[model samples]
Target chain A: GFPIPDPYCWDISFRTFYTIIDDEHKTLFNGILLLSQADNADHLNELRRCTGKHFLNEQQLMQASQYAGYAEHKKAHDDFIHKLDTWDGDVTYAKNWLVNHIKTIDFKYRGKI
Target chain B: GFPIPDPYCWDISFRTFYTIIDDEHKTLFNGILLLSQADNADHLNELRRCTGKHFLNEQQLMQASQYAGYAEHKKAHDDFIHKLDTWDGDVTYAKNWLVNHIKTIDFKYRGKI
Candidate 1:
């Protein structure tokens, strides 16, 4: 299929929150949310490196509360990528993950707004 | 009280520099190791809100001179609690002020990476 669509910069209230998503999810979806370089390709790659430095930060956050599920959570991230990598960037994969995934799954899962 | 370990990212040698942090003695300490956020989360949060909202060149750095600090001194970003302000300074603040601060304090602080 195709690679995930470029992340979006959604405007909520008067604030703007950028999302660098690579999967479909509802309110409880699992995916990475990067803080830098939202819309650019070269920039996103750079952000990936920066995000690597933050694995420790993420671990710390996951440990602070009852949400101590990083071992499994990180595995989930790996599994998603493994599945994506298997697709080989085919149009079917693109249509399946990027298009249909958001339309059928994410659309049905939308909560409030 | 025994579980706290300081965050110490030491600097490697081989550099010619002179300034407050660079010229003096330093040690490993991490009660936040941060001027804005360390030992004071409120101020850090304030800084987080103002980071991208206001002009970067006019930022208020506790110890500004060491230009290295600016790159190392991230603008007190907060990405927790699912993530999620700015201020007006009348005339006392301007783009020029940021330039002055970087030259005056940050470069002098020569804060470590």
Candidate 2:
């Protein structure tokens, strides 16, 4: 059988395959997926809320595991939330980051988790 | 002229008479107001997110101001969030607690803040 296509662009192909990390990542995707049908700052703020939760959880894991480059990765996470915190009524801001962050930043910490 | 009324049951009558505290309370009301039209757990989680932000800010204020009943109040806030975190699928669960907590607990610390 062929692969089940992801409804969202993040794609199952991008999953780190870790346990809760990937689960939480999917939850983040689920959240942003809801946001695609949404408009207005409140919806964006809810997305930001989930981003904060996911980032905090990841930061905790990094700290617990003593992941290298933790501080810089955290700053990256903070910048994304800050962007979401003050986004200009658009979804593209989040969409771009979702793909880029996973491929560029998160991929580095696969086995490290 | 008639006094303006709140769309939600938590009114200006419930104002904590503190600046950011009341502002955050209004935001929480705004959040839950949006939730009234919602019928899903995700929306509830968004309200919980605002609650966390508001509580953490208030706790920081209490600690800074040396509010006498800080610990107990924090525990109360914690219990409320815990309830939201594991809530049954209903808006009334949040609604009742919103009024009761403001009146019974948060009232006692008005001038202290």
Top-lDDT structure, candidate number = 2
TM-score of 1: 0.29
Q: How does model 2 score by TM-score?
A: 0.49
DockQ of each candidate, alpha-carbon based: 0.04, 0.04
- Give TM-score, chain B, model 2: 0.82
Name the regions of candidate 1 deviating beyond 4 angstroms: A1-7, A10-41, A66-68, A80-113, B1-113
Clashes of each: 15, 0
Compared with the true structure, what per-residue lDDT tens digits does model 2 show for residues B1-113?
Answer: 12323576356787888867888887777667777877576777778888999999988876543455779999989998887777775666566667777777787766544
| RMSD in Å for model 1 | 15.6
lDDT, residue B51, model 2? 96
* Least well predicted 10-residue stretch by lDDT in candidate 1 chain A: A22-31
Cα lDDT tens digits, model 1, B71-106, are 443443221111222223211232233333334544
